[PDB]
Amino acid sequence: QETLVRPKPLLLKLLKSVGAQKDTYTMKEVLFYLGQYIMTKRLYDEKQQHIVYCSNDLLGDLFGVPSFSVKEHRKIYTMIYRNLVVV
């Protein structure tokens, strides 16, 4: 199934910086564009690519952390949900 979401302003800015062109998204779309953003800006550690450094990026201002691990599935979703409204 799908869950529809409306990003808050900073998330919306990020999404649009990587090609997104709308106000309402599916969660699958949000997660795609965030992955695209991180990959495009090479925010991850070159050697241990589960580690994302974002203290000097907009993503750090969005998530409110200097870094995180891609393996923290719960915390990533929590940090994304804080920046959107469901439906």
Partner: peptide, 13 residues
């Protein structure tokens, strides 16, 4: 592993 595959594993719950 590549960031690409790790994030896909994330998306692919």
């Amino acid at each position: 592993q590549t960031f690409x595959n790790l994030w896909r594993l994330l998306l692919q719950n």
